[PDB]
Design a protein around this ligand. Sequence first.
Ligand SMILES: [Mg+2]
Ligand SMILES: [Mg+2]
Ligand SMILES: [Mg+2]
Ligand SMILES: [Zn+2]
Lengths: 148, 94, 38, 141
Amino acid sequence: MALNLQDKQAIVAEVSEVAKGALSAVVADSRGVTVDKMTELRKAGREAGVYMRVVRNTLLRRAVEGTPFECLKDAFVGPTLIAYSMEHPGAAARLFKEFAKANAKFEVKAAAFEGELIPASQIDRLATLPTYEEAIARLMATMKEASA
Amino acid sequence: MFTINAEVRKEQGKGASRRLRAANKFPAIIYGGKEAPLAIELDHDKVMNMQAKAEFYSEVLTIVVDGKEIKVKAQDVQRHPYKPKLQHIDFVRA
Amino acid sequence: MKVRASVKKLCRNCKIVKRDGVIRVICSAEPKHKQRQG
Amino acid sequence: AKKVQAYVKLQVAAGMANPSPPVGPALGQQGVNIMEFCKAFNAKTDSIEKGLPIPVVITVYADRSFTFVTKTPPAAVLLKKAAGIKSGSGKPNKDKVGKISRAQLQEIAQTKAADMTGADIEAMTRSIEGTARSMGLVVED
RNA sequence: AGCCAGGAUGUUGGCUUAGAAGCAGCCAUCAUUUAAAGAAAGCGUAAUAGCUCACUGGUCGAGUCGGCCUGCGCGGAAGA
Ligand SMILES: [Mg+2]
Ligand SMILES: [Mg+2]
Ligand SMILES: [Mg+2]
Ligand SMILES: [Zn+2]
Protein backbone atom coordinates (compact mmCIF):
# COMPACT_ATOMS: atom_id res chain seq x y z
CA MET A 1 0.00 0.00 0.00
CA ALA A 2 0.90 3.65 0.19
CA LEU A 3 1.68 5.87 3.16
CA ASN A 4 -0.51 8.76 4.31
CA LEU A 5 0.21 11.11 1.41
CA GLN A 6 -2.01 8.62 -0.43
CA ASP A 7 -4.54 7.71 2.25
CA LYS A 8 -5.29 11.44 2.25
CA GLN A 9 -6.15 11.69 -1.46
CA ALA A 10 -8.59 8.80 -1.32
CA ILE A 11 -10.16 11.12 1.27
CA VAL A 12 -9.94 14.70 -0.10
CA ALA A 13 -11.21 13.33 -3.43
CA GLU A 14 -13.89 11.00 -2.12
CA VAL A 15 -15.29 13.49 0.42
CA SER A 16 -15.66 16.35 -2.07
CA GLU A 17 -18.09 14.01 -3.83
CA VAL A 18 -20.21 14.03 -0.71
CA ALA A 19 -19.70 17.77 -0.29
CA LYS A 20 -20.64 18.22 -3.95
CA GLY A 21 -23.03 15.28 -4.64
CA ALA A 22 -26.67 14.13 -4.97
CA LEU A 23 -27.76 10.59 -3.82
CA SER A 24 -26.21 7.60 -1.92
CA ALA A 25 -26.92 3.84 -2.09
CA VAL A 26 -25.54 0.66 -0.53
CA VAL A 27 -24.17 -2.85 -1.15
CA ALA A 28 -22.06 -5.80 0.14
CA ASP A 29 -20.13 -7.61 -2.73
CA SER A 30 -19.25 -10.88 -1.02
CA ARG A 31 -18.83 -12.74 -4.35
CA GLY A 32 -18.48 -9.52 -6.29
CA VAL A 33 -17.40 -10.98 -9.67
CA THR A 34 -15.92 -8.75 -12.40
CA VAL A 35 -18.72 -9.19 -14.87
CA ASP A 36 -20.13 -7.41 -11.83
CA LYS A 37 -18.08 -4.24 -12.09
CA MET A 38 -18.02 -4.46 -15.93
CA THR A 39 -21.81 -4.01 -16.08
CA GLU A 40 -22.37 -1.28 -13.36
CA LEU A 41 -19.69 0.91 -15.18
CA ARG A 42 -21.81 0.77 -18.28
CA LYS A 43 -24.61 1.64 -15.82
CA ALA A 44 -22.48 4.48 -14.47
CA GLY A 45 -22.00 4.65 -18.21
CA ARG A 46 -25.69 5.34 -18.89
CA GLU A 47 -25.72 7.23 -15.64
CA ALA A 48 -23.06 9.45 -17.43
CA GLY A 49 -19.87 7.38 -17.30
CA VAL A 50 -17.29 8.32 -14.60
CA TYR A 51 -19.76 10.78 -12.76
CA MET A 52 -20.50 7.72 -10.47
CA ARG A 53 -18.13 5.58 -8.52
CA VAL A 54 -18.25 2.63 -6.01
CA VAL A 55 -14.65 2.78 -4.62
CA ARG A 56 -14.73 -0.16 -2.17
CA ASN A 57 -13.41 1.46 1.07
CA THR A 58 -15.73 0.43 3.89
CA LEU A 59 -12.78 0.74 6.14
CA LEU A 60 -14.73 3.05 8.48
CA ARG A 61 -11.18 4.27 8.63
CA ARG A 62 -11.75 5.58 5.01
CA ALA A 63 -15.27 6.26 3.71
CA VAL A 64 -16.29 7.18 7.25
CA GLU A 65 -13.23 9.47 7.42
CA GLY A 66 -15.46 11.14 4.77
CA THR A 67 -18.62 10.86 6.96
CA PRO A 68 -18.16 13.02 10.15
CA PHE A 69 -18.06 15.49 7.28
CA GLU A 70 -21.64 14.91 5.82
CA CYS A 71 -23.86 11.77 6.00
CA LEU A 72 -23.14 10.75 9.66
CA LYS A 73 -25.94 8.13 9.10
CA ASP A 74 -23.15 5.87 7.91
CA ALA A 75 -21.23 5.24 11.08
CA PHE A 76 -23.82 2.44 10.91
CA VAL A 77 -23.31 1.35 7.28
CA GLY A 78 -19.52 1.07 7.24
CA PRO A 79 -19.24 -2.08 9.36
CA THR A 80 -18.35 -5.21 7.42
CA LEU A 81 -17.98 -5.29 3.63
CA ILE A 82 -19.45 -2.33 1.77
CA ALA A 83 -19.54 -0.71 -1.72
CA TYR A 84 -20.28 3.10 -1.38
CA SER A 85 -21.95 4.80 -4.54
CA MET A 86 -22.07 8.64 -4.89
CA GLU A 87 -23.98 10.77 -7.44
CA HIS A 88 -22.84 14.10 -8.88
CA PRO A 89 -25.31 15.23 -11.62
CA GLY A 90 -28.40 13.26 -12.59
CA ALA A 91 -31.70 12.97 -10.73
CA ALA A 92 -31.55 11.58 -7.22
CA ALA A 93 -32.07 8.71 -9.74
CA ARG A 94 -32.23 5.09 -10.96
CA LEU A 95 -28.88 4.38 -9.26
CA PHE A 96 -31.20 3.33 -6.50
CA LYS A 97 -33.29 1.13 -8.76
CA GLU A 98 -30.88 -1.28 -10.45
CA PHE A 99 -28.91 -2.00 -7.33
CA ALA A 100 -32.03 -3.81 -6.11
CA LYS A 101 -32.80 -5.20 -9.55
CA ALA A 102 -29.12 -6.16 -10.06
CA ASN A 103 -28.64 -7.91 -6.67
CA ALA A 104 -32.14 -9.39 -7.15
CA LYS A 105 -30.58 -11.20 -10.12
CA PHE A 106 -28.59 -13.07 -7.46
CA GLU A 107 -25.76 -10.57 -8.16
CA VAL A 108 -24.65 -11.11 -4.54
CA LYS A 109 -26.33 -9.57 -1.45
CA ALA A 110 -27.17 -5.85 -1.17
CA ALA A 111 -26.31 -5.37 2.55
CA ALA A 112 -30.06 -5.89 2.79
CA PHE A 113 -29.46 -2.40 1.37
CA GLU A 114 -28.73 -0.74 4.69
CA GLY A 115 -29.66 2.43 2.71
CA GLU A 116 -28.35 6.01 3.03
CA LEU A 117 -28.74 9.74 2.38
CA ILE A 118 -30.83 12.24 0.39
CA PRO A 119 -33.00 12.78 3.39
CA ALA A 120 -30.85 11.44 6.37
CA SER A 121 -32.17 7.92 6.96
CA GLN A 122 -32.41 4.21 5.99
CA ILE A 123 -33.83 1.52 3.68
CA ASP A 124 -36.60 1.02 1.03
CA ARG A 125 -36.35 0.81 -2.74
CA LEU A 126 -37.93 3.86 -4.38
CA ALA A 127 -38.66 4.79 -7.96
CA THR A 128 -39.76 8.13 -6.46
CA LEU A 129 -37.27 9.15 -9.02
CA PRO A 130 -36.59 9.51 -12.86
CA THR A 131 -40.14 10.03 -13.21
CA TYR A 132 -38.03 13.21 -12.62
CA GLU A 133 -38.62 15.10 -15.86
CA GLU A 134 -42.06 13.43 -15.50
CA ALA A 135 -43.22 16.96 -15.07
CA ILE A 136 -45.29 15.64 -18.00
CA ALA A 137 -47.18 13.93 -15.18
CA ARG A 138 -48.01 17.58 -14.49
CA LEU A 139 -48.53 18.39 -18.16
CA MET A 140 -51.20 15.68 -18.51
CA ALA A 141 -52.43 17.14 -15.19
CA THR A 142 -53.18 20.28 -17.24
CA MET A 143 -55.46 19.48 -20.26
CA LYS A 144 -57.13 16.61 -18.35
CA GLU A 145 -57.77 19.03 -15.42
CA ALA A 146 -58.91 21.77 -17.88
CA SER A 147 -61.23 19.30 -19.78
CA ALA A 148 -62.50 16.64 -17.20
CA MET B 1 24.69 18.69 8.85
CA PHE B 2 26.61 15.58 9.82
CA THR B 3 27.41 15.83 13.51
CA ILE B 4 30.28 13.65 14.66
CA ASN B 5 31.04 13.52 18.35
CA ALA B 6 34.65 12.62 19.05
CA GLU B 7 37.42 12.68 21.63
CA VAL B 8 41.05 13.66 21.49
CA ARG B 9 43.37 10.67 21.44
CA LYS B 10 45.15 10.09 24.70
CA GLU B 11 47.08 7.16 23.23
CA GLN B 12 48.84 6.83 19.86
CA GLY B 13 50.70 4.07 18.04
CA LYS B 14 50.00 0.68 16.58
CA GLY B 15 49.29 -0.73 20.01
CA ALA B 16 46.55 1.66 20.99
CA SER B 17 45.00 1.93 17.53
CA ARG B 18 44.35 -1.80 17.53
CA ARG B 19 42.94 -1.63 21.07
CA LEU B 20 40.55 1.10 20.01
CA ARG B 21 39.28 -1.01 17.11
CA ALA B 22 38.58 -3.93 19.46
CA ALA B 23 36.12 -1.62 21.24
CA ASN B 24 34.16 -0.42 18.22
CA LYS B 25 36.13 2.86 18.22
CA PHE B 26 38.59 3.83 15.53
CA PRO B 27 41.24 6.48 15.13
CA ALA B 28 41.24 9.36 12.64
CA ILE B 29 43.02 12.66 12.37
CA ILE B 30 42.14 16.29 11.72
CA TYR B 31 44.78 18.39 10.06
CA GLY B 32 44.78 21.48 7.90
CA GLY B 33 44.58 25.20 8.55
CA LYS B 34 47.62 26.90 10.10
CA GLU B 35 47.08 25.27 13.50
CA ALA B 36 48.49 21.89 14.66
CA PRO B 37 47.01 18.50 13.72
CA LEU B 38 44.61 16.71 16.12
CA ALA B 39 44.42 12.99 16.97
CA ILE B 40 40.76 11.89 17.06
CA GLU B 41 38.92 8.78 18.17
CA LEU B 42 35.48 8.14 16.66
CA ASP B 43 32.62 5.75 17.42
CA HIS B 44 32.62 3.14 14.66
CA ASP B 45 29.08 2.01 13.93
CA LYS B 46 28.06 5.66 13.85
CA VAL B 47 30.55 6.94 11.27
CA MET B 48 29.74 3.75 9.32
CA ASN B 49 26.06 4.44 9.03
CA MET B 50 26.83 8.08 8.29
CA GLN B 51 29.38 7.39 5.57
CA ALA B 52 26.77 5.13 3.97
CA LYS B 53 25.34 8.28 2.36
CA ALA B 54 27.43 9.76 -0.50
CA GLU B 55 27.02 13.28 0.89
CA PHE B 56 29.52 12.34 3.60
CA TYR B 57 32.39 12.75 1.18
CA SER B 58 31.05 15.87 -0.58
CA GLU B 59 29.49 18.02 2.17
CA VAL B 60 31.52 19.90 4.73
CA LEU B 61 30.86 18.16 8.05
CA THR B 62 31.31 18.95 11.74
CA ILE B 63 33.19 17.18 14.51
CA VAL B 64 32.40 18.02 18.13
CA VAL B 65 35.75 17.30 19.70
CA ASP B 66 35.57 18.30 23.36
CA GLY B 67 32.93 20.97 22.58
CA LYS B 68 34.27 22.99 19.63
CA GLU B 69 32.86 22.06 16.25
CA ILE B 70 35.97 21.93 14.06
CA LYS B 71 34.13 21.64 10.76
CA VAL B 72 36.13 19.70 8.18
CA LYS B 73 36.08 17.64 5.00
CA ALA B 74 36.76 13.96 4.46
CA GLN B 75 40.06 13.65 2.63
CA ASP B 76 40.80 9.96 2.90
CA VAL B 77 39.36 6.69 4.26
CA GLN B 78 40.98 3.40 5.26
CA ARG B 79 38.57 0.51 4.94
CA HIS B 80 39.31 -2.97 6.30
CA PRO B 81 41.05 -5.14 3.74
CA TYR B 82 38.14 -7.65 3.69
CA LYS B 83 35.43 -6.67 6.22
CA PRO B 84 32.75 -4.03 6.20
CA LYS B 85 34.47 -1.71 8.73
CA LEU B 86 36.56 1.50 8.84
CA GLN B 87 40.16 1.76 9.87
CA HIS B 88 41.07 5.39 9.69
CA ILE B 89 40.14 8.74 8.25
CA ASP B 90 42.00 11.88 7.20
CA PHE B 91 39.96 15.04 7.81
CA VAL B 92 40.97 18.30 6.19
CA ARG B 93 40.29 21.48 8.06
CA ALA B 94 37.96 23.70 6.13
CA MET C 1 13.69 -39.24 -0.28
CA LYS C 2 16.93 -37.45 -1.18
CA VAL C 3 19.52 -37.34 1.60
CA ARG C 4 22.30 -34.84 0.69
CA ALA C 5 24.32 -32.56 2.94
CA SER C 6 22.91 -29.27 1.64
CA VAL C 7 19.11 -29.46 1.56
CA LYS C 8 17.29 -26.10 0.73
CA LYS C 9 13.73 -25.35 -0.55
CA LEU C 10 13.01 -26.30 -4.16
CA CYS C 11 9.34 -25.50 -4.97
CA ARG C 12 7.62 -22.48 -3.47
CA ASN C 13 5.76 -25.18 -1.48
CA CYS C 14 8.82 -26.90 0.00
CA LYS C 15 8.93 -26.14 3.75
CA ILE C 16 11.98 -27.18 5.90
CA VAL C 17 11.50 -28.77 9.28
CA LYS C 18 13.73 -29.71 12.14
CA ARG C 19 12.48 -33.11 13.39
CA ASP C 20 14.59 -35.00 15.99
CA GLY C 21 18.12 -33.73 15.49
CA VAL C 22 17.77 -33.82 11.73
CA ILE C 23 16.90 -31.07 9.24
CA ARG C 24 14.30 -31.93 6.62
CA VAL C 25 12.30 -30.62 3.65
CA ILE C 26 8.64 -31.40 3.06
CA CYS C 27 6.83 -30.53 -0.20
CA SER C 28 3.04 -30.72 -0.29
CA ALA C 29 3.01 -30.72 -4.12
CA GLU C 30 6.03 -32.74 -5.20
CA PRO C 31 7.29 -35.93 -3.47
CA LYS C 32 10.63 -35.65 -5.24
CA HIS C 33 11.59 -32.77 -2.96
CA LYS C 34 11.67 -34.63 0.34
CA GLN C 35 15.11 -34.23 1.92
CA ARG C 36 17.03 -35.36 5.06
CA GLN C 37 20.64 -35.34 6.51
CA GLY C 38 20.54 -31.58 6.45
CA ALA D 1 -25.75 -14.29 -20.75
CA LYS D 2 -25.37 -14.46 -16.96
CA LYS D 3 -23.91 -18.02 -17.10
CA VAL D 4 -21.09 -19.45 -19.35
CA GLN D 5 -21.14 -23.26 -20.17
CA ALA D 6 -19.20 -24.13 -23.38
CA TYR D 7 -17.15 -22.02 -25.81
CA VAL D 8 -14.45 -22.78 -28.39
CA LYS D 9 -13.50 -20.08 -30.86
CA LEU D 10 -11.57 -20.98 -33.98
CA GLN D 11 -12.00 -18.16 -36.44
CA VAL D 12 -14.09 -19.44 -39.36
CA ALA D 13 -15.04 -17.99 -42.78
CA ALA D 14 -18.19 -16.54 -44.36
CA GLY D 15 -18.42 -17.15 -48.14
CA MET D 16 -19.00 -20.86 -47.57
CA ALA D 17 -19.65 -22.35 -44.17
CA ASN D 18 -18.53 -25.90 -44.96
CA PRO D 19 -14.91 -26.48 -44.01
CA SER D 20 -13.24 -29.87 -43.54
CA PRO D 21 -9.42 -29.74 -43.33
CA PRO D 22 -9.16 -26.59 -41.09
CA VAL D 23 -12.20 -27.13 -38.82
CA GLY D 24 -15.08 -29.01 -40.44
CA PRO D 25 -15.82 -31.98 -38.09
CA ALA D 26 -13.92 -30.53 -35.15
CA LEU D 27 -16.38 -27.59 -35.05
CA GLY D 28 -19.37 -29.86 -34.29
CA GLN D 29 -19.21 -33.40 -32.94
CA GLN D 30 -20.26 -33.55 -29.26
CA GLY D 31 -24.00 -32.92 -29.46
CA VAL D 32 -23.42 -30.36 -32.22
CA ASN D 33 -24.97 -30.46 -35.72
CA ILE D 34 -22.81 -29.97 -38.85
CA MET D 35 -26.05 -29.63 -40.84
CA GLU D 36 -27.14 -26.38 -39.09
CA PHE D 37 -24.17 -23.98 -39.34
CA CYS D 38 -25.00 -23.69 -43.12
CA LYS D 39 -28.72 -23.30 -42.36
CA ALA D 40 -28.13 -20.80 -39.52
CA PHE D 41 -24.67 -19.02 -39.83
CA ASN D 42 -25.15 -17.82 -43.38
CA ALA D 43 -28.43 -16.32 -42.08
CA LYS D 44 -26.22 -13.86 -40.13
CA THR D 45 -23.35 -13.81 -42.67
CA ASP D 46 -24.53 -11.91 -45.77
CA SER D 47 -26.09 -8.99 -43.93
CA ILE D 48 -22.53 -7.71 -43.20
CA GLU D 49 -19.61 -9.06 -45.31
CA LYS D 50 -17.85 -12.36 -46.28
CA GLY D 51 -14.47 -14.14 -46.31
CA LEU D 52 -12.45 -12.74 -43.45
CA PRO D 53 -11.79 -13.83 -39.71
CA ILE D 54 -14.79 -14.91 -37.57
CA PRO D 55 -14.30 -16.18 -34.00
CA VAL D 56 -17.55 -17.74 -32.63
CA VAL D 57 -19.69 -19.32 -29.76
CA ILE D 58 -22.66 -21.62 -30.05
CA THR D 59 -25.51 -22.70 -27.74
CA VAL D 60 -25.25 -26.50 -27.64
CA TYR D 61 -25.91 -28.36 -24.38
CA ALA D 62 -26.65 -32.00 -25.16
CA ASP D 63 -29.94 -30.77 -26.70
CA ARG D 64 -29.50 -32.11 -30.30
CA SER D 65 -29.91 -28.76 -32.10
CA PHE D 66 -28.67 -25.31 -31.05
CA THR D 67 -28.57 -21.56 -31.69
CA PHE D 68 -25.46 -19.75 -33.06
CA VAL D 69 -23.92 -16.56 -31.64
CA THR D 70 -21.61 -13.98 -33.34
CA LYS D 71 -18.48 -12.09 -32.12
CA THR D 72 -15.76 -9.69 -33.29
CA PRO D 73 -12.41 -9.65 -35.10
CA PRO D 74 -8.90 -9.76 -33.50
CA ALA D 75 -7.49 -6.27 -32.86
CA ALA D 76 -3.80 -6.52 -33.74
CA VAL D 77 -5.05 -8.07 -37.00
CA LEU D 78 -6.76 -4.82 -37.92
CA LEU D 79 -3.18 -3.78 -38.67
CA LYS D 80 -2.93 -6.11 -41.67
CA LYS D 81 -5.81 -5.28 -43.99
CA ALA D 82 -6.20 -2.14 -41.88
CA ALA D 83 -2.57 -0.99 -41.86
CA GLY D 84 0.18 -2.45 -44.07
CA ILE D 85 2.51 -5.41 -43.58
CA LYS D 86 0.86 -8.73 -42.77
CA SER D 87 3.56 -10.39 -40.66
CA GLY D 88 4.95 -8.23 -37.83
CA SER D 89 8.77 -8.53 -37.91
CA GLY D 90 11.12 -10.12 -40.53
CA LYS D 91 14.01 -8.72 -38.52
CA PRO D 92 13.23 -10.43 -35.11
CA ASN D 93 12.06 -7.74 -32.68
CA LYS D 94 15.66 -7.08 -31.69
CA ASP D 95 15.00 -4.56 -34.59
CA LYS D 96 12.03 -2.11 -34.49
CA VAL D 97 10.69 -2.77 -37.99
CA GLY D 98 6.94 -1.95 -38.42
CA LYS D 99 5.13 1.32 -39.44
CA ILE D 100 1.77 2.98 -38.51
CA SER D 101 -1.25 5.04 -39.61
CA ARG D 102 -2.14 7.52 -36.80
CA ALA D 103 -5.40 8.54 -38.47
CA GLN D 104 -6.40 4.94 -38.34
CA LEU D 105 -6.14 3.33 -34.86
CA GLN D 106 -9.15 5.31 -33.75
CA GLU D 107 -11.88 4.66 -36.28
CA ILE D 108 -10.31 1.29 -37.16
CA ALA D 109 -10.28 0.49 -33.45
CA GLN D 110 -13.73 2.11 -33.02
CA THR D 111 -14.95 -0.62 -35.38
CA LYS D 112 -14.36 -2.80 -32.27
CA ALA D 113 -16.55 -0.56 -30.07
CA ALA D 114 -18.75 -3.45 -28.91
CA ASP D 115 -16.02 -5.29 -26.96
CA MET D 116 -14.06 -2.85 -24.83
CA THR D 117 -14.02 -1.42 -21.36
CA GLY D 118 -12.95 2.19 -21.89
CA ALA D 119 -15.86 4.60 -21.43
CA ASP D 120 -14.01 7.29 -23.39
CA ILE D 121 -13.83 6.12 -27.02
CA GLU D 122 -10.50 7.95 -26.94
CA ALA D 123 -9.54 5.49 -24.17
CA MET D 124 -10.40 2.68 -26.53
CA THR D 125 -7.68 4.21 -28.65
CA ARG D 126 -5.05 4.32 -25.92
CA SER D 127 -5.47 0.56 -25.66
CA ILE D 128 -4.62 0.18 -29.34
CA GLU D 129 -1.34 1.97 -28.70
CA GLY D 130 0.29 -1.03 -27.03
CA THR D 131 -1.73 -3.37 -29.23
CA ALA D 132 0.06 -1.54 -32.07
CA ARG D 133 3.44 -1.06 -30.33
CA SER D 134 3.33 -4.83 -30.38
CA MET D 135 6.62 -4.85 -32.26
CA GLY D 136 7.88 -1.35 -31.59
CA LEU D 137 6.42 0.05 -34.82
CA VAL D 138 6.26 3.86 -34.38
CA VAL D 139 3.26 5.93 -35.43
CA GLU D 140 3.82 9.10 -37.49
CA ASP D 141 1.73 11.26 -35.18
C1' A E 1 -0.51 -14.90 9.26
C1' G E 2 -5.03 -17.09 8.68
C1' C E 3 -10.22 -16.98 6.67
C1' C E 4 -14.39 -14.64 2.56
C1' A E 5 -14.06 -12.54 -1.94
C1' G E 6 -12.23 -11.05 -6.40
C1' G E 7 -7.91 -11.80 -9.31
C1' A E 8 -10.65 -8.80 -15.24
C1' U E 9 -11.12 -6.28 -21.14
C1' G E 10 -7.99 -5.08 -25.89
C1' U E 11 -5.87 -10.31 -26.18
C1' U E 12 -3.96 -16.35 -28.30
C1' G E 13 0.74 -8.76 -27.51
C1' G E 14 4.28 -9.38 -31.39
C1' C E 15 7.63 -12.81 -33.24
C1' U E 16 8.80 -18.02 -33.68
C1' U E 17 6.80 -22.83 -33.95
C1' A E 18 3.32 -28.86 -36.00
C1' G E 19 1.30 -26.31 -31.74
C1' A E 20 4.44 -21.16 -27.99
C1' A E 21 -3.20 -18.98 -26.19
C1' G E 22 0.27 -15.30 -18.83
C1' C E 23 3.77 -19.16 -18.73
C1' A E 24 10.12 -23.67 -24.52
C1' G E 25 12.51 -19.49 -26.95
C1' C E 26 13.22 -13.95 -28.99
C1' C E 27 11.61 -8.53 -28.54
C1' A E 28 8.46 -5.73 -26.25
C1' U E 29 6.03 -5.12 -21.52
C1' C E 30 1.99 -0.59 -22.98
C1' A E 31 -3.43 0.53 -22.48
C1' U E 32 -7.81 -0.19 -20.52
C1' U E 33 -11.78 -1.34 -16.44
C1' U E 34 -10.91 -0.59 -11.52
C1' A E 35 -10.95 -1.27 -4.94
C1' A E 36 -6.85 -4.41 -7.18
C1' A E 37 -5.10 -7.67 -10.80
C1' G E 38 2.22 -8.77 -13.82
C1' A E 39 1.18 -8.39 -21.74
C1' A E 40 2.56 -12.53 -15.52
C1' A E 41 5.85 -15.48 -9.70
C1' G E 42 4.80 -21.14 -9.73
C1' C E 43 1.59 -25.91 -10.87
C1' G E 44 -0.61 -27.62 -15.42
C1' U E 45 -1.55 -28.43 -21.00
C1' A E 46 -0.25 -31.55 -27.42
C1' A E 47 -1.84 -26.62 -27.42
C1' U E 48 -6.28 -24.39 -25.19
C1' A E 49 -8.57 -25.86 -20.92
C1' G E 50 -7.81 -26.27 -15.28
C1' C E 51 -5.32 -24.74 -10.02
C1' U E 52 -2.46 -20.79 -7.59
C1' C E 53 0.60 -16.20 -6.75
C1' A E 54 1.68 -11.11 -6.99
C1' C E 55 -2.20 -7.03 -6.12
C1' U E 56 -6.87 -5.07 -3.92
C1' G E 57 -11.80 -5.19 -1.03
C1' G E 58 -13.70 -7.73 3.55
C1' U E 59 -12.94 -10.23 8.33
C1' C E 60 -9.51 -10.12 12.50
C1' G E 61 -7.46 -6.92 16.24
C1' A E 62 -1.35 -5.31 18.10
C1' G E 63 2.41 -5.75 17.08
C1' U E 64 5.04 -7.46 12.79
C1' C E 65 8.75 -8.21 8.59
C1' G E 66 13.93 -9.22 6.87
C1' G E 67 18.92 -7.86 5.91
C1' C E 68 24.14 -6.22 8.51
C1' C E 69 27.52 -7.38 12.44
C1' U E 70 28.90 -10.74 16.34
C1' G E 71 28.97 -15.24 20.80
C1' C E 72 27.91 -20.62 21.63
C1' G E 73 25.88 -24.63 19.22
C1' C E 74 23.30 -28.52 14.66
C1' G E 75 24.01 -31.56 10.10
C1' G E 76 27.93 -32.75 6.91
C1' A E 77 30.92 -37.59 10.11
C1' A E 78 31.79 -45.08 7.45
C1' G E 79 36.33 -49.77 9.93
C1' A E 80 37.88 -53.88 10.99
MG1 LIG F 1 52.36 -4.53 19.32
MG1 LIG G 1 11.67 -40.12 14.03
MG1 LIG H 1 30.32 -41.13 12.24
ZN1 LIG I 1 8.58 -28.73 -4.29
